[PDB]
Amino acid sequence: MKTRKGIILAGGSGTRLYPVTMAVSQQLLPIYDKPMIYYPLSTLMLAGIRDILIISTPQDTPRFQQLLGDGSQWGLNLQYKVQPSPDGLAQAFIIGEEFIGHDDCALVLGDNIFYGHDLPKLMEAAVNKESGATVFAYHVNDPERYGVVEFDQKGTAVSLEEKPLQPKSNYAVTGLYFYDNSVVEMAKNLKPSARGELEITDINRIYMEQGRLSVAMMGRGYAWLDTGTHQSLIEASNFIATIEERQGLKVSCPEEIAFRKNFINAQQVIELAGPLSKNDYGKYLLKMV
Amino acid sequence: MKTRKGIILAGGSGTRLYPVTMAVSQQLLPIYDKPMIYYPLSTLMLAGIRDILIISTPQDTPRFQQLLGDGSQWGLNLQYKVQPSPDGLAQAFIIGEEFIGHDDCALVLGDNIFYGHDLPKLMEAAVNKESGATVFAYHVNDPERYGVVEFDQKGTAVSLEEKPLQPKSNYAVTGLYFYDNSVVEMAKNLKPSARGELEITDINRIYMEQGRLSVAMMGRGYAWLDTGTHQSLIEASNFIATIEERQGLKVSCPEEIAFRKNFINAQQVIELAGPLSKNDYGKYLLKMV
Amino acid sequence: MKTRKGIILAGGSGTRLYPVTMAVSQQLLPIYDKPMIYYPLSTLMLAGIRDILIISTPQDTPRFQQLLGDGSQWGLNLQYKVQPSPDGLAQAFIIGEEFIGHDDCALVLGDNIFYGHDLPKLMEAAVNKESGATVFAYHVNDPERYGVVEFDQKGTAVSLEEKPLQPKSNYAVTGLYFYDNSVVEMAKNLKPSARGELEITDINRIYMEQGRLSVAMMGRGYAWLDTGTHQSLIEASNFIATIEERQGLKVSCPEEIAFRKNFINAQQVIELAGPLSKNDYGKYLLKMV
Amino acid sequence: MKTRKGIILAGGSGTRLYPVTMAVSQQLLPIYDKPMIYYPLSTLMLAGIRDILIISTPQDTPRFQQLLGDGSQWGLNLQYKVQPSPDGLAQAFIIGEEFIGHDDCALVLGDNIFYGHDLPKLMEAAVNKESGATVFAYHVNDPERYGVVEFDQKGTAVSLEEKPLQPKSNYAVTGLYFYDNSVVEMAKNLKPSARGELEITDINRIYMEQGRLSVAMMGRGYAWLDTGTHQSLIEASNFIATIEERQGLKVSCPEEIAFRKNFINAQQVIELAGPLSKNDYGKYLLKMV
């Protein structure tokens, strides 16, 4: 089956970004012209996923609801669930067990921003994979900060380690994952790691050992914009601004993607444009159709 | 009397910045490494004002309270009051009548960012003025968007117009004002303009006609950053970021300002820095003391 | 035949960028960590093109030769020729007539900077096209400034205009072109335009009217960094720096491309690294092998 | 005597910046909208110095002369001299001995960028000093990279060390110095240091030991931009671009300075702005007068 459910994990207290995140959720922070979460949301929409569960903190979930509603305005079906404590990426599947049901599901971090050509085809295999899991590898300068995947000479991925002190490679596993239905029980069966979290890397290693993990390489022609510091956030906004102003197009605009993939029509677009017409956003949509 | 009370007017629905202000008050949005509200707050602190009333919309006032508390952590006394409808800048003095009492009071807009090494000195005269008012002029190339002050050959302020279609000068009257106690009665007597607002420019014209208006000039050593569009927000964040890292200092950091003006001591700075120490905002403070 | 010759047109006086370009040729200006010309040179190398003619002004041509030499150090064959006066892009084929001989040839502008995922594949049809020409269309905000290609409902390119006052579309024809051997005679018979230049757009319209022009779409996932203003130059440098620092990889590094495509071996790279080892460039190459 | 002569030391091979300095003199590289040399040149002009000697390498000197000419277009008198080998900053006084004659003279490095609203007043004292020397200190986080000046409790300069492994303070002695006529003979008596150069710090230590040294402090309102690496160059260009755009001015624009200090008149400004009018550098000047 094609993966048609997705979860955006957008919780966390954001201590690493204080004081900016003392009174605004990290995933609501603007990346130039739109909140951060519009980017990973766009990534799921580009993969054809329209049924999505958003997980956030007790305090932030209602702000995401206020921003997005049930998503029907974009031809989506959005649901929300609260994560009491940030216990690890894998907890997303426990919290989302009912939402997932017996289907396949993708997980994307609310702060995962991708930009690049052919992202839909980069994700196509993952979306259509019969069983197992797919993750994406990206070369970074500081592998120690991420889940790291090692490849042998044939170029086959043969190991995964979470924040290794001596990375076996410079390839980090990104915040976009595709899983089959077995991930739910797999997650419920995990024990906390040394840092007290249900590790996504433990989930991935299981799939790998059973030969069910596909590691899709995301080439250097793609940008995976970091959002870990005040500096990286402003560099992400400038990057997106440089692209949009030059092209006269927006990057990860849900309304545009919904329209282009026919989740909604021109008429619906014109309505959505109304409340946004005081700036380039609403005008952009009207000009579009 | 030295002006020792101040009001930060930080209401508004933020429609102009949608969708980034759909779930977030514009004044909580970050300008590089701190919430926008830290900027006008620092401006008042730099004038020696420690008793401050923050006004916002019903919905947003509690978020400002959660972010700032009563201000005692920085040696300030912050109180809060709500503005049900944005009836105009001058309504700040009606809502703040009880807070003001019989004292002089300054008003700063919550979305105004003032920068300038000599600003404290420039505000000194305004703080000490015995009666009347002081406003701050800044050269812009789009005067038609603001209150505009015209000067005669001698250099005396001769007229004030709110968004003149044919500006008489290129000097905008910025959102920082120091008034004597009579502004409250002036405000309570104003009638709404054509746009249905109690205008700050009408208040300023009254002081001008009584011969009690001083105009402080902010020359090219100053910056008054635009926060009106997605584009101006990133331009403002870029400005703060480049100046802080190239000049090795922090712009409008209340903890630093409170410490430097002795509102708080080194022990308190370290205590405040703890929760903020995962990034340079907190580490800078620890190094400072 | 596969296109195996290329021309980099890097002349012009650069008046648009004065006074920066009174002091340095535009194509020698740094785009973060390397001279601008390294970018279009990398593009040709990525297409497998190693036999290249560099055209510049009488004053600058020796500068490029000083920088690049004959390119043998990177397994290329670089030659130089002077363009007495900037009489138009098409003059490149007259100046390069002897160099081109009877072969196919690509033309890239010395200030053309592309960044994106599958560039080699995007150019593959062009490199292998039997006869005719191939150009690349990119969506921009200001088509008026470029050669514009209009598409009909079916998506077929139906017209080409050079800087139309009323663009028939928002697709600009970039500075990368692939031609068969017939372009030389077209160029020799072209009459100057209203502005007194031999227009590349007239050459392209000739191919188009013969039904021999392919228009390869460069999606919004690619960046075509503008280099026309002081502002666009720093946005380009920041864009590249953002990508490189995050990845720990360089964009358009000729030594790396030469090495990866086996134009040179590791031993060769070590020698090239020597004179560059005082900064990350030299160190990067050493680390690479 | 008022200091009326200045020397800009602009040699060196700039190997740390390869490959961008392979075919371009480092001081001809742009810092946003004008060549690097314009900055230290403006620093001298702001001190009222109009008789200037530019010293560079045998390959680069002619390029500066090509760009700047005799400086008469800006009411200056510029002359040039070649430094055969980079034997040290202090060699400037030997090479420039004939130029200096019996007068006082300032020395500024060709790659130092000084910014600050009060710099002119700050330099006024130095220009008027009857005898002795004035140097400029600036706080840095990496004092070990520069000449370092230590102050006692009183605030008196008590030691000077060139690149100390154990810095005695964090105040760097920047690349701007004002000397009386005794500096020439001091230079003739210097012996090369361990690194084989005539050190400016030995000269300054002599003045210090004779109790004839003044140290001007550049505090928070100043910026002293690093131009040593590819990264610092873009950081410096970002600083200039942001300050210029946000504050509506030009940093170190010789035409503007020449006009404002009455070195040239409005007609000459327009004439000079013509060739520069395709962009804002020229348009700003036209608007200025």
Ligand SMILES: O=c1ccn([C@@H]2O[C@H](COP(=O)(O)OP(=O)(O)O[C@H]3O[C@H](CO)[C@@H](O)[C@H](O)[C@H]3O)[C@@H](O)[C@H]2O)c(=O)[nH]1
């Ligand atoms: O104790 C925790 C841990 C994470 N989070 C949140 O979950 C998201 C994950 O971010 P982060 O903690 O910085 O990622 P890491 O936990 O360091 O790494 C995970 O996410 C990386 C990027 O997606 C993967 O490379 C790693 O393999 C995976 O373990 C964020 O928005 C966090 O706020 C919390 O709230 N609390």
Ligand SMILES: O=c1ccn([C@@H]2O[C@H](COP(=O)(O)OP(=O)(O)O[C@H]3O[C@H](CO)[C@@H](O)[C@H](O)[C@H]3O)[C@@H](O)[C@H]2O)c(=O)[nH]1
């Ligand atoms: O009743 C009100 C009116 C305004 N605001 C806020 O105040 C700021 C002011 O913005 P805006 O209303 O759009 O500015 P204008 O009212 O058009 O202009 C005012 O602010 C300018 C400087 O920013 C001055 O030059 C003008 O003279 C003055 O009238 C915003 O964040 C508003 O939301 C409130 O909170 N309540």
Ligand SMILES: O=c1ccn([C@@H]2O[C@H](COP(=O)(O)OP(=O)(O)O[C@H]3O[C@H](CO)[C@@H](O)[C@H](O)[C@H]3O)[C@@H](O)[C@H]2O)c(=O)[nH]1
């Ligand atoms: O005789 C010439 C003409 C141009 N150039 C250089 O080529 C580049 C092109 O810039 P410019 O001359 O300003 O562009 P245009 O010639 O106005 O336009 C051309 O380049 C555009 C994309 O850059 C295309 O869209 C247009 O169709 C094509 O005609 C610059 O670095 C020029 O200096 C030369 O070296 N020699």
Ligand SMILES: O=c1ccn([C@@H]2O[C@H](COP(=O)(O)OP(=O)(O)O[C@H]3O[C@H](CO)[C@@H](O)[C@H](O)[C@H]3O)[C@@H](O)[C@H]2O)c(=O)[nH]1
């Ligand atoms: O004989 C020489 C020596 C240097 N330079 C140039 O002068 C600048 C100085 O650069 P560099 O030699 O690398 O700096 P240092 O000599 O290490 O440091 C000097 O410059 C610093 C400020 O930039 C001061 O703090 C130090 O005290 C002073 O010794 C460069 O553009 C050089 O190419 C010359 O043109 N000729």
